[PDB]
Amino acid sequence: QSPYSAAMAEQRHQEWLRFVDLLKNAYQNDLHLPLLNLMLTPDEREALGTRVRIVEELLRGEMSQRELKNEFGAGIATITRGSNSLKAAPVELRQWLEEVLLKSD
Amino acid sequence: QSPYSAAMAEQRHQEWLRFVDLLKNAYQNDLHLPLLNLMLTPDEREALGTRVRIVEELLRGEMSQRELKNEFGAGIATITRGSNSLKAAPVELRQWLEEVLLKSD
Predict the structure, then answer these.
(1) What CATH code is carried by the domain that includes residue A94?
(2) Does A60 touch chain B if contact means CB atoms closer than 8 Å?
(3) What domain range is A51 assigned to?
(4) Distance (Å, whole) CA A19 – CA B93
(5) Which of B37, B23, B7 has the alpha carbon at shortest distance from A91?
(6) Contact A34 B92 (CB under 8 A)
(7) Domain count along chain B
(8) Nearest-CA residue of chain A relative to B40?
(9) Dist CA A48 CA B21 (whole Å)
(10) Which of A5, A88, A91, B23 could in theory staple to B37 by disulfide, Cβ–Cβ 3.0 to 4.6 A?
(11) For residues A82 and A104, what is the distance between their CA atoms, to the nearest angstrom?
């Protein structure tokens, strides 16, 4: 799989791992300080911390109908956001939270 | 710093590390498969792979004027995107690419 030139994108799906590997390597080396500022964004830090609360309130009993009605009406787009249920294993996600919550406390 | 209750957000800036630590821990344990699907987005994978090329073309000589004129005119918003130059150490970012490029090849 080496057509002489390799600085382009045979399928373009390799640049995704290159970014996941560089970022993954940046989150482990802590040298992403610079990329953290360029990456540091408002809507990003908002949507990020937003998911942390959404999932938290979810188990709490506030998936969105609590304070998520002025952003659409009542989880009319966020609750059914075009995502993957069994195609992504939700029990797998609840399992990770189940590991940090059932850790040992 | 423990006002009895701690399941809220004294400053709300701790939920950012909790997400960076969970994600950082998810990128190292590879168990983020589920979060990868919920996180797997189109504009995200596009903007991500987009930065990989932008920075690449940047050193190549195509910061944006090459194929970045229909998205605004010619890097009129992306080239000056509200970011932090010396407040984030750009030479620090070029240093990281300088480590993966001057690695040993």
Answers:
(1) 1.10.1270.10
(2) no
(3) 1-105
(4) 14
(5) B37
(6) yes
(7) 1
(8) A83
(9) 12
(10) A88
(11) 35
